[PDB]
Amino acid sequence: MNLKDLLAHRENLMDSAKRARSAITDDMDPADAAQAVENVKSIISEIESTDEAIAARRGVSDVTQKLKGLTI
C-alpha cells in the first residue's frame, strides 16, 4: 500500500483498539476480560509497527530529496 493507505490503516487499527478496550467493561467475566486485553495488546503491537512503516515511508523521501540536494 501507499502512504495515504498506511495512514488510513493506522487510524483503523487505532479505532479498532479503542472499540476493543471499550468493550472491556468491569461487568465482563475475568476470563473474557483477560482474553480481550490480550487482543488489544496485539492490535496495539500492529499500530506501533505501522507507525514504523509510516516513518520509513516519510523518511525515505525526506532523505532522497536531501541527498539529491547535496550532490556535487
Side-chain angles (χ1 to χ4, degrees):
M1 22 173 127
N2 73 25
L3 187 55
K4 293 181 181 179
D5 297 298
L6 270 188
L7 295 162
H9 182 68
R10 201 264 188 197
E11 172 177 3
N12 293 325
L13 261 20
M14 256 286 170
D15 192 271
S16 67
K18 293 181 181 180
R19 292 179 181 176
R21 112 115 283 203
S22 279
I24 309 166
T25 52
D26 56 2
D27 74 319
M28 177 174 47
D29 192 84
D32 295 278
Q35 184 66 45
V37 165
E38 218 47 52
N39 302 166
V40 178
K41 282 177 145 86
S42 265
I43 294 175
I44 99 84
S45 192
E46 288 306 342
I47 293 152
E48 283 175 355
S49 155
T50 294
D51 277 344
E52 293 170 326
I54 287 169
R57 292 180 184 277
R58 264 164 186 164
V60 149
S61 68
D62 284 345
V63 144
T64 297
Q65 213 58 49
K66 240 172 141 359
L67 252 19
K68 261 168 193 177
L70 275 182
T71 280
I72 248 174

Short mmCIF file of all heavy atoms in Angstrom, two decimals:
data_model
loop_
_atom_site.label_atom_id
_atom_site.label_comp_id
_atom_site.label_asym_id
_atom_site.label_seq_id
_atom_site.Cartn_x
_atom_site.Cartn_y
_atom_site.Cartn_z
N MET A 1 0.82 -1.20 0.00
CA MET A 1 0.00 0.00 0.00
C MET A 1 0.86 1.26 0.00
O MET A 1 2.02 1.23 0.42
CB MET A 1 -0.94 0.01 1.21
CG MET A 1 -0.48 -0.87 2.36
SD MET A 1 -1.59 -0.68 3.95
CE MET A 1 -2.02 -2.55 4.25
N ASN A 2 0.29 2.36 -0.47
CA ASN A 2 0.97 3.65 -0.45
C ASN A 2 0.68 4.44 0.82
O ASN A 2 -0.09 3.99 1.67
CB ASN A 2 0.59 4.48 -1.68
CG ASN A 2 -0.82 5.02 -1.60
OD1 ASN A 2 -1.38 5.19 -0.52
ND2 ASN A 2 -1.42 5.29 -2.76
N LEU A 3 1.31 5.60 0.95
CA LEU A 3 1.33 6.33 2.21
C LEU A 3 -0.09 6.63 2.69
O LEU A 3 -0.40 6.47 3.87
CB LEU A 3 2.12 7.63 2.07
CG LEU A 3 2.37 8.41 3.36
CD1 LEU A 3 3.05 7.54 4.40
CD2 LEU A 3 3.21 9.65 3.08
N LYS A 4 -0.94 7.08 1.77
CA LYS A 4 -2.29 7.51 2.12
C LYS A 4 -3.06 6.34 2.73
O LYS A 4 -3.89 6.52 3.62
CB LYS A 4 -3.03 8.04 0.88
CG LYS A 4 -2.45 9.36 0.29
CD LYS A 4 -3.23 9.86 -0.95
CE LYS A 4 -2.59 11.16 -1.48
NZ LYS A 4 -3.28 11.69 -2.68
N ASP A 5 -2.76 5.14 2.23
CA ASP A 5 -3.38 3.89 2.67
C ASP A 5 -2.86 3.47 4.03
O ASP A 5 -3.63 2.96 4.87
CB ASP A 5 -3.10 2.76 1.67
CG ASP A 5 -3.70 3.02 0.27
OD1 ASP A 5 -4.94 3.13 0.14
OD2 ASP A 5 -2.90 3.08 -0.71
N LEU A 6 -1.55 3.66 4.24
CA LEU A 6 -0.90 3.38 5.50
C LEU A 6 -1.48 4.22 6.63
O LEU A 6 -1.64 3.74 7.74
CB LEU A 6 0.60 3.64 5.40
CG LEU A 6 1.51 2.49 4.96
CD1 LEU A 6 2.93 2.94 5.13
CD2 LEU A 6 1.27 1.22 5.76
N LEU A 7 -1.80 5.47 6.33
CA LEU A 7 -2.35 6.37 7.32
C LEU A 7 -3.78 5.98 7.65
O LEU A 7 -4.16 5.98 8.83
CB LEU A 7 -2.25 7.82 6.85
CG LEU A 7 -0.82 8.39 6.67
CD1 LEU A 7 -0.79 9.68 5.79
CD2 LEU A 7 -0.17 8.65 8.02
N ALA A 8 -4.57 5.61 6.63
CA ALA A 8 -5.93 5.13 6.88
C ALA A 8 -5.89 3.84 7.72
O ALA A 8 -6.68 3.66 8.67
CB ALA A 8 -6.69 4.91 5.58
N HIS A 9 -4.96 2.96 7.35
CA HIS A 9 -4.77 1.68 8.01
C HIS A 9 -4.43 1.87 9.47
O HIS A 9 -5.03 1.23 10.35
CB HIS A 9 -3.67 0.88 7.31
CG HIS A 9 -3.44 -0.47 7.89
ND1 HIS A 9 -4.36 -1.49 7.80
CD2 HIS A 9 -2.40 -0.97 8.60
CE1 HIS A 9 -3.89 -2.57 8.40
NE2 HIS A 9 -2.69 -2.28 8.89
N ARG A 10 -3.47 2.75 9.74
CA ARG A 10 -3.09 3.08 11.12
C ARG A 10 -4.30 3.56 11.92
O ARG A 10 -4.53 3.12 13.04
CB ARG A 10 -2.01 4.17 11.14
CG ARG A 10 -1.22 4.22 12.44
CD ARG A 10 -1.77 5.26 13.40
NE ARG A 10 -0.86 5.37 14.53
CZ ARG A 10 -1.16 5.92 15.70
NH1 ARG A 10 -2.36 6.46 15.95
NH2 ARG A 10 -0.22 5.93 16.65
N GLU A 11 -5.06 4.48 11.35
CA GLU A 11 -6.18 5.02 12.03
C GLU A 11 -7.27 3.97 12.28
O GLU A 11 -7.89 3.97 13.34
CB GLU A 11 -6.70 6.20 11.25
CG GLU A 11 -7.98 6.75 11.77
CD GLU A 11 -8.39 7.97 10.95
OE1 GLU A 11 -7.66 8.29 9.96
OE2 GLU A 11 -9.42 8.60 11.30
N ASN A 12 -7.48 3.06 11.32
CA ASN A 12 -8.38 1.88 11.53
C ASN A 12 -7.96 0.96 12.67
O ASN A 12 -8.77 0.49 13.45
CB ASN A 12 -8.56 1.07 10.25
CG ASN A 12 -9.31 1.83 9.17
OD1 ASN A 12 -10.21 2.60 9.48
ND2 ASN A 12 -8.95 1.63 7.92
N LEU A 13 -6.67 0.76 12.80
CA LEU A 13 -6.16 -0.03 13.86
C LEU A 13 -6.37 0.65 15.18
O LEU A 13 -6.62 0.02 16.16
CB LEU A 13 -4.69 -0.27 13.63
CG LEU A 13 -4.27 -1.58 13.01
CD1 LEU A 13 -5.39 -2.23 12.31
CD2 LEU A 13 -3.15 -1.36 12.10
N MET A 14 -6.25 1.96 15.21
CA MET A 14 -6.38 2.69 16.44
C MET A 14 -7.82 2.69 16.82
O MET A 14 -8.17 2.53 17.95
CB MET A 14 -5.95 4.11 16.20
CG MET A 14 -4.62 4.39 16.75
SD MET A 14 -4.89 4.49 18.57
CE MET A 14 -3.13 4.55 19.20
N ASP A 15 -8.65 2.90 15.84
CA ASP A 15 -10.12 2.84 16.02
C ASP A 15 -10.51 1.49 16.60
O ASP A 15 -11.24 1.42 17.61
CB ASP A 15 -10.83 3.12 14.67
CG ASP A 15 -12.36 3.38 14.81
OD1 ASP A 15 -13.16 2.43 14.76
OD2 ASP A 15 -12.77 4.56 14.93
N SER A 16 -10.00 0.39 16.02
CA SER A 16 -10.43 -0.92 16.48
C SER A 16 -9.87 -1.34 17.84
O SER A 16 -10.53 -2.11 18.58
CB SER A 16 -10.27 -2.00 15.41
OG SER A 16 -8.95 -2.23 15.15
N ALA A 17 -8.68 -0.83 18.17
CA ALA A 17 -8.10 -0.99 19.51
C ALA A 17 -8.97 -0.28 20.54
O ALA A 17 -9.10 -0.73 21.69
CB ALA A 17 -6.70 -0.43 19.56
N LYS A 18 -9.56 0.84 20.15
CA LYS A 18 -10.46 1.54 21.05
C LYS A 18 -11.83 0.86 21.22
O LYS A 18 -12.29 0.75 22.35
CB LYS A 18 -10.61 2.99 20.64
CG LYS A 18 -9.34 3.75 20.81
CD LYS A 18 -9.55 5.18 20.40
CE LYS A 18 -8.28 5.96 20.55
NZ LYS A 18 -8.54 7.36 20.12
N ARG A 19 -12.46 0.40 20.14
CA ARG A 19 -13.72 -0.35 20.27
C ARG A 19 -13.41 -1.56 21.12
O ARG A 19 -14.19 -1.92 21.99
CB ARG A 19 -14.35 -0.74 18.92
CG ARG A 19 -14.89 0.50 18.10
CD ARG A 19 -15.53 0.22 16.69
NE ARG A 19 -15.95 1.49 16.06
CZ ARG A 19 -16.48 1.65 14.83
NH1 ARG A 19 -16.70 0.60 14.02
NH2 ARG A 19 -16.80 2.87 14.39
N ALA A 20 -12.23 -2.13 20.95
CA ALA A 20 -11.89 -3.31 21.73
C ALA A 20 -11.75 -3.02 23.22
O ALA A 20 -12.23 -3.81 24.03
CB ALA A 20 -10.66 -4.02 21.19
N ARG A 21 -11.11 -1.91 23.59
CA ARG A 21 -10.91 -1.64 25.03
C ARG A 21 -12.17 -1.09 25.70
O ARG A 21 -12.36 -1.26 26.90
CB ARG A 21 -9.61 -0.86 25.34
CG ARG A 21 -9.72 0.56 25.86
CD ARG A 21 -9.18 0.68 27.30
NE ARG A 21 -10.18 0.15 28.24
CZ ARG A 21 -10.28 0.45 29.54
NH1 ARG A 21 -9.43 1.30 30.13
NH2 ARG A 21 -11.25 -0.09 30.26
N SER A 22 -13.02 -0.43 24.91
CA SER A 22 -14.33 -0.01 25.38
C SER A 22 -15.19 -1.21 25.77
O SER A 22 -15.98 -1.14 26.71
CB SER A 22 -15.04 0.83 24.31
OG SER A 22 -14.58 2.17 24.33
N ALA A 23 -15.04 -2.30 25.03
CA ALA A 23 -15.85 -3.49 25.24
C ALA A 23 -15.51 -4.15 26.58
O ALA A 23 -16.34 -4.86 27.15
CB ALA A 23 -15.66 -4.48 24.10
N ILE A 24 -14.30 -3.92 27.06
CA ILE A 24 -13.88 -4.43 28.36
C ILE A 24 -14.44 -3.59 29.50
O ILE A 24 -13.72 -2.80 30.11
CB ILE A 24 -12.34 -4.48 28.47
CG1 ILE A 24 -11.74 -5.20 27.27
CG2 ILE A 24 -11.93 -5.15 29.77
CD1 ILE A 24 -10.24 -5.02 27.13
N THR A 25 -15.73 -3.75 29.77
CA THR A 25 -16.34 -3.18 30.96
C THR A 25 -16.20 -4.12 32.16
O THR A 25 -16.08 -5.34 31.99
CB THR A 25 -17.83 -2.87 30.74
OG1 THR A 25 -18.50 -4.04 30.24
CG2 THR A 25 -18.00 -1.73 29.75
N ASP A 26 -16.21 -3.55 33.36
CA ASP A 26 -15.89 -4.30 34.56
C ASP A 26 -17.07 -5.16 35.01
O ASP A 26 -17.07 -5.70 36.12
CB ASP A 26 -15.46 -3.36 35.69
CG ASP A 26 -16.51 -2.29 35.98
OD1 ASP A 26 -17.58 -2.32 35.33
OD2 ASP A 26 -16.26 -1.44 36.85
N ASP A 27 -18.07 -5.27 34.15
CA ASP A 27 -19.14 -6.25 34.34
C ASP A 27 -18.94 -7.45 33.41
O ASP A 27 -19.83 -8.29 33.28
CB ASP A 27 -20.50 -5.62 34.09
CG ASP A 27 -20.78 -5.36 32.62
OD1 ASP A 27 -19.84 -4.93 31.91
OD2 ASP A 27 -21.92 -5.59 32.18
N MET A 28 -17.78 -7.53 32.78
CA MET A 28 -17.42 -8.68 31.97
C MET A 28 -16.69 -9.73 32.79
O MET A 28 -16.06 -9.42 33.80
CB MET A 28 -16.55 -8.25 30.78
CG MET A 28 -16.07 -9.40 29.91
SD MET A 28 -15.12 -8.80 28.32
CE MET A 28 -13.94 -7.49 29.15
N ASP A 29 -16.78 -10.99 32.36
CA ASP A 29 -16.15 -12.09 33.07
C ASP A 29 -14.62 -12.03 32.99
O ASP A 29 -14.07 -11.86 31.90
CB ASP A 29 -16.65 -13.40 32.45
CG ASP A 29 -16.31 -14.60 33.27
OD1 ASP A 29 -17.08 -14.92 34.22
OD2 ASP A 29 -15.27 -15.23 32.95
N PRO A 30 -13.91 -12.18 34.14
CA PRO A 30 -12.45 -12.23 34.21
C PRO A 30 -11.74 -12.97 33.08
O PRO A 30 -10.74 -12.48 32.56
CB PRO A 30 -12.18 -12.95 35.55
CG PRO A 30 -13.54 -13.30 36.11
CD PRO A 30 -14.49 -12.33 35.48
N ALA A 31 -12.23 -14.15 32.68
CA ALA A 31 -11.59 -14.94 31.63
C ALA A 31 -11.61 -14.22 30.29
O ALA A 31 -10.58 -14.07 29.62
CB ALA A 31 -12.26 -16.31 31.52
N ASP A 32 -12.80 -13.73 29.94
CA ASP A 32 -13.02 -12.94 28.73
C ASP A 32 -12.27 -11.62 28.80
O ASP A 32 -11.72 -11.15 27.80
CB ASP A 32 -14.51 -12.67 28.59
CG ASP A 32 -15.30 -13.94 28.34
OD1 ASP A 32 -15.31 -14.32 27.14
OD2 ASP A 32 -15.88 -14.57 29.29
N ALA A 33 -12.26 -11.02 29.98
CA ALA A 33 -11.57 -9.75 30.15
C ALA A 33 -10.08 -9.93 29.90
O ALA A 33 -9.49 -9.11 29.23
CB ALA A 33 -11.81 -9.16 31.53
N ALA A 34 -9.50 -11.01 30.44
CA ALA A 34 -8.10 -11.32 30.21
C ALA A 34 -7.82 -11.57 28.73
O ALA A 34 -6.81 -11.10 28.22
CB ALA A 34 -7.64 -12.48 31.05
N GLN A 35 -8.70 -12.29 28.04
CA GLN A 35 -8.52 -12.56 26.61
C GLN A 35 -8.59 -11.26 25.87
O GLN A 35 -7.71 -10.95 25.06
CB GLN A 35 -9.58 -13.48 26.04
CG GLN A 35 -9.39 -13.88 24.55
CD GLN A 35 -8.14 -14.74 24.21
OE1 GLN A 35 -7.85 -15.70 24.92
NE2 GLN A 35 -7.44 -14.42 23.11
N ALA A 36 -9.64 -10.48 26.16
CA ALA A 36 -9.84 -9.19 25.49
C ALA A 36 -8.62 -8.29 25.59
O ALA A 36 -8.28 -7.62 24.62
CB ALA A 36 -11.08 -8.49 26.01
N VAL A 37 -7.95 -8.28 26.75
CA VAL A 37 -6.73 -7.49 26.96
C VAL A 37 -5.58 -8.00 26.09
O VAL A 37 -4.75 -7.23 25.60
CB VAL A 37 -6.31 -7.51 28.44
CG1 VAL A 37 -4.88 -7.01 28.63
CG2 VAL A 37 -7.25 -6.68 29.25
N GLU A 38 -5.55 -9.31 25.90
CA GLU A 38 -4.56 -9.93 25.04
C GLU A 38 -4.75 -9.42 23.60
O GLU A 38 -3.81 -9.02 22.94
CB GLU A 38 -4.72 -11.45 25.12
CG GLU A 38 -3.41 -12.22 25.10
CD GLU A 38 -2.35 -11.65 26.06
OE1 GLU A 38 -2.69 -11.46 27.25
OE2 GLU A 38 -1.19 -11.41 25.62
N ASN A 39 -6.00 -9.40 23.15
CA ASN A 39 -6.33 -8.90 21.82
C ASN A 39 -5.97 -7.43 21.60
O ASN A 39 -5.46 -7.06 20.55
CB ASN A 39 -7.81 -9.08 21.58
CG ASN A 39 -8.26 -10.52 21.70
OD1 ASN A 39 -9.45 -10.76 21.78
ND2 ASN A 39 -7.32 -11.47 21.70
N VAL A 40 -6.23 -6.60 22.59
CA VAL A 40 -5.84 -5.19 22.48
C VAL A 40 -4.32 -5.02 22.39
O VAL A 40 -3.84 -4.25 21.57
CB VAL A 40 -6.42 -4.34 23.66
CG1 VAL A 40 -5.96 -2.89 23.56
CG2 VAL A 40 -7.92 -4.40 23.67
N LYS A 41 -3.57 -5.73 23.24
CA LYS A 41 -2.09 -5.68 23.18
C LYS A 41 -1.56 -6.06 21.78
O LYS A 41 -0.53 -5.54 21.32
CB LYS A 41 -1.49 -6.59 24.24
CG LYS A 41 -1.50 -6.04 25.63
CD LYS A 41 -0.94 -7.12 26.54
CE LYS A 41 -0.11 -6.55 27.69
NZ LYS A 41 -1.00 -6.20 28.83
N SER A 42 -2.29 -6.94 21.10
CA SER A 42 -1.93 -7.39 19.74
C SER A 42 -2.23 -6.39 18.65
O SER A 42 -1.45 -6.24 17.71
CB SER A 42 -2.64 -8.69 19.41
OG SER A 42 -1.74 -9.74 19.72
N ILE A 43 -3.37 -5.74 18.74
CA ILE A 43 -3.71 -4.67 17.83
C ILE A 43 -2.75 -3.54 18.08
O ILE A 43 -2.17 -3.03 17.13
CB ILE A 43 -5.15 -4.21 18.03
CG1 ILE A 43 -6.11 -5.35 17.63
CG2 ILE A 43 -5.41 -2.98 17.20
CD1 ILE A 43 -7.58 -5.01 17.92
N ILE A 44 -2.51 -3.17 19.34
CA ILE A 44 -1.55 -2.07 19.55
C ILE A 44 -0.15 -2.41 19.01
O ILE A 44 0.55 -1.56 18.46
CB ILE A 44 -1.51 -1.45 21.03
CG1 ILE A 44 -0.37 -2.00 21.86
CG2 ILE A 44 -2.88 -1.45 21.76
CD1 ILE A 44 0.92 -1.27 21.58
N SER A 45 0.25 -3.66 19.13
CA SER A 45 1.52 -4.07 18.55
C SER A 45 1.57 -3.80 17.04
O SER A 45 2.61 -3.46 16.48
CB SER A 45 1.75 -5.54 18.82
OG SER A 45 3.07 -5.87 18.52
N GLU A 46 0.43 -3.94 16.38
CA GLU A 46 0.34 -3.68 14.95
C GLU A 46 0.32 -2.19 14.60
O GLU A 46 0.90 -1.80 13.58
CB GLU A 46 -0.88 -4.37 14.32
CG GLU A 46 -0.76 -5.87 14.21
CD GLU A 46 0.49 -6.37 13.48
OE1 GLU A 46 1.15 -5.58 12.72
OE2 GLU A 46 0.82 -7.57 13.66
N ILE A 47 -0.35 -1.39 15.43
CA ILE A 47 -0.28 0.07 15.35
C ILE A 47 1.17 0.54 15.40
O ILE A 47 1.60 1.28 14.52
CB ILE A 47 -1.09 0.79 16.46
CG1 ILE A 47 -2.59 0.55 16.29
CG2 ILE A 47 -0.83 2.28 16.43
CD1 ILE A 47 -3.38 0.60 17.59
N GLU A 48 1.93 0.08 16.40
CA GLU A 48 3.33 0.51 16.55
C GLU A 48 4.14 0.20 15.31
O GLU A 48 4.91 1.03 14.81
CB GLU A 48 3.99 -0.16 17.73
CG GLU A 48 3.58 0.43 19.05
CD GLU A 48 4.15 -0.35 20.23
OE1 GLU A 48 4.78 -1.41 20.00
OE2 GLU A 48 3.97 0.10 21.38
N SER A 49 3.93 -1.00 14.82
CA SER A 49 4.62 -1.49 13.65
C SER A 49 4.22 -0.74 12.34
O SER A 49 5.03 -0.57 11.42
CB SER A 49 4.37 -2.98 13.60
OG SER A 49 4.47 -3.44 12.29
N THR A 50 2.98 -0.26 12.26
CA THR A 50 2.51 0.55 11.13
C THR A 50 3.08 1.94 11.25
O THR A 50 3.40 2.58 10.24
CB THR A 50 0.97 0.60 11.10
OG1 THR A 50 0.49 -0.71 10.83
CG2 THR A 50 0.43 1.57 10.03
N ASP A 51 3.19 2.43 12.48
CA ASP A 51 3.84 3.69 12.70
C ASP A 51 5.26 3.69 12.14
O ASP A 51 5.69 4.68 11.57
CB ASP A 51 3.86 4.03 14.18
CG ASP A 51 2.56 4.65 14.63
OD1 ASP A 51 1.77 5.11 13.75
OD2 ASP A 51 2.32 4.69 15.86
N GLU A 52 5.97 2.58 12.32
CA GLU A 52 7.30 2.45 11.73
C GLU A 52 7.26 2.47 10.21
O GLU A 52 8.09 3.13 9.59
CB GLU A 52 8.00 1.18 12.19
CG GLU A 52 8.32 1.21 13.67
CD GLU A 52 8.79 -0.17 14.19
OE1 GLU A 52 8.31 -1.24 13.68
OE2 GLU A 52 9.66 -0.19 15.10
N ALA A 53 6.29 1.77 9.61
CA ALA A 53 6.15 1.78 8.16
C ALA A 53 5.95 3.22 7.65
O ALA A 53 6.52 3.63 6.64
CB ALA A 53 5.02 0.89 7.74
N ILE A 54 5.16 4.00 8.40
CA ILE A 54 4.86 5.38 8.03
C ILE A 54 6.11 6.25 8.14
O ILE A 54 6.37 7.08 7.26
CB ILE A 54 3.73 5.93 8.91
CG1 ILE A 54 2.40 5.29 8.49
CG2 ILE A 54 3.63 7.44 8.83
CD1 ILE A 54 1.30 5.57 9.43
N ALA A 55 6.86 6.07 9.22
CA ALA A 55 8.11 6.80 9.45
C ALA A 55 9.12 6.47 8.34
O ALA A 55 9.73 7.37 7.77
CB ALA A 55 8.67 6.47 10.83
N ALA A 56 9.26 5.18 8.02
CA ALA A 56 10.10 4.74 6.93
C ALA A 56 9.69 5.39 5.61
O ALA A 56 10.55 5.92 4.91
CB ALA A 56 10.09 3.23 6.81
N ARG A 57 8.40 5.38 5.27
CA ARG A 57 7.98 5.98 4.00
C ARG A 57 8.23 7.47 3.97
O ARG A 57 8.67 7.98 2.96
CB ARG A 57 6.51 5.69 3.65
CG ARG A 57 6.26 4.25 3.32
CD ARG A 57 4.80 3.96 2.96
NE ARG A 57 4.62 2.53 2.74
CZ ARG A 57 4.90 1.89 1.60
NH1 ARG A 57 5.36 2.56 0.54
NH2 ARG A 57 4.71 0.58 1.50
N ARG A 58 7.94 8.18 5.07
CA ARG A 58 8.13 9.63 5.08
C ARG A 58 9.61 9.97 5.02
O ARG A 58 10.03 10.78 4.20
CB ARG A 58 7.51 10.26 6.31
CG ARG A 58 6.13 10.80 6.07
CD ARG A 58 5.44 11.04 7.41
NE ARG A 58 4.04 11.43 7.26
CZ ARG A 58 3.15 11.40 8.24
NH1 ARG A 58 3.50 10.97 9.45
NH2 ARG A 58 1.89 11.78 8.02
N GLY A 59 10.38 9.31 5.87
CA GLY A 59 11.82 9.48 5.93
C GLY A 59 12.54 9.24 4.61
O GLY A 59 13.39 10.04 4.22
N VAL A 60 12.20 8.15 3.91
CA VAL A 60 12.90 7.82 2.68
C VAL A 60 12.77 8.91 1.64
O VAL A 60 13.74 9.22 0.96
CB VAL A 60 12.47 6.49 2.08
CG1 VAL A 60 12.59 6.52 0.55
CG2 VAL A 60 13.30 5.37 2.65
N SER A 61 11.60 9.51 1.50
CA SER A 61 11.51 10.59 0.53
C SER A 61 12.13 11.90 1.06
O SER A 61 12.63 12.71 0.26
CB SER A 61 10.10 10.75 -0.06
OG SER A 61 9.21 11.21 0.93
N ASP A 62 12.12 12.10 2.39
CA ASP A 62 12.84 13.23 3.03
C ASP A 62 14.34 13.19 2.73
O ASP A 62 14.97 14.21 2.45
CB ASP A 62 12.69 13.23 4.56
CG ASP A 62 11.32 13.71 5.04
OD1 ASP A 62 10.58 14.32 4.21
OD2 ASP A 62 10.99 13.46 6.24
N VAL A 63 14.86 11.98 2.83
CA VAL A 63 16.26 11.67 2.70
C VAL A 63 16.69 11.80 1.25
O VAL A 63 17.66 12.48 0.95
CB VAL A 63 16.52 10.26 3.28
CG1 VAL A 63 17.58 9.49 2.51
CG2 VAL A 63 16.87 10.39 4.72
N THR A 64 15.95 11.16 0.35
CA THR A 64 16.26 11.15 -1.06
C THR A 64 16.33 12.57 -1.58
O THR A 64 17.19 12.91 -2.39
CB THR A 64 15.20 10.37 -1.82
OG1 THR A 64 15.23 9.02 -1.37
CG2 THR A 64 15.45 10.41 -3.33
N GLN A 65 15.45 13.40 -1.06
CA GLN A 65 15.30 14.74 -1.55
C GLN A 65 16.44 15.58 -1.05
O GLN A 65 16.63 16.71 -1.46
CB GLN A 65 14.00 15.33 -1.04
CG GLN A 65 13.33 16.31 -1.99
CD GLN A 65 13.01 15.71 -3.35
OE1 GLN A 65 12.44 14.62 -3.44
NE2 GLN A 65 13.39 16.42 -4.40
N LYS A 66 17.21 15.03 -0.12
CA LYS A 66 18.20 15.83 0.53
C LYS A 66 19.53 15.40 0.02
O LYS A 66 20.37 16.19 -0.26
CB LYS A 66 18.15 15.63 2.03
CG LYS A 66 17.86 16.89 2.76
CD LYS A 66 17.63 16.61 4.20
CE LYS A 66 18.25 17.69 5.03
NZ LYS A 66 18.91 18.67 4.14
N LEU A 67 19.70 14.10 -0.08
CA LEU A 67 20.76 13.59 -0.89
C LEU A 67 20.82 14.32 -2.20
O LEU A 67 21.84 14.86 -2.57
CB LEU A 67 20.54 12.12 -1.11
CG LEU A 67 21.56 11.34 -0.33
CD1 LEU A 67 22.09 12.21 0.73
CD2 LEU A 67 20.90 10.18 0.26
N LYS A 68 19.73 14.33 -2.94
CA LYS A 68 19.75 14.95 -4.24
C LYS A 68 20.36 16.30 -4.04
O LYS A 68 21.22 16.72 -4.78
CB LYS A 68 18.34 15.13 -4.75
CG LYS A 68 17.91 14.08 -5.73
CD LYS A 68 16.42 14.16 -5.97
CE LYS A 68 15.92 12.93 -6.68
NZ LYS A 68 14.44 12.95 -6.87
N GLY A 69 19.87 17.04 -3.07
CA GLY A 69 20.28 18.41 -2.92
C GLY A 69 21.67 18.64 -2.35
O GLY A 69 22.07 19.75 -2.11
N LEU A 70 22.40 17.57 -2.13
CA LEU A 70 23.70 17.70 -1.53
C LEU A 70 24.69 17.20 -2.51
O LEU A 70 25.85 17.06 -2.22
CB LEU A 70 23.80 16.83 -0.29
CG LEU A 70 23.30 17.39 1.03
CD1 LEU A 70 23.53 16.42 2.11
CD2 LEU A 70 23.96 18.66 1.34
N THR A 71 24.21 16.90 -3.70
CA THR A 71 25.10 16.33 -4.67
C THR A 71 25.94 17.37 -5.35
O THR A 71 25.47 18.46 -5.65
CB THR A 71 24.36 15.51 -5.68
OG1 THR A 71 24.08 14.23 -5.11
CG2 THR A 71 25.21 15.30 -6.88
N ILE A 72 27.21 17.03 -5.58
CA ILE A 72 28.15 17.89 -6.30
C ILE A 72 29.35 18.31 -5.46
O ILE A 72 29.21 18.79 -4.34
CB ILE A 72 27.45 19.12 -6.88
CG1 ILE A 72 27.44 19.05 -8.40
CG2 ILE A 72 28.15 20.38 -6.42
CD1 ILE A 72 26.65 20.15 -9.02
#
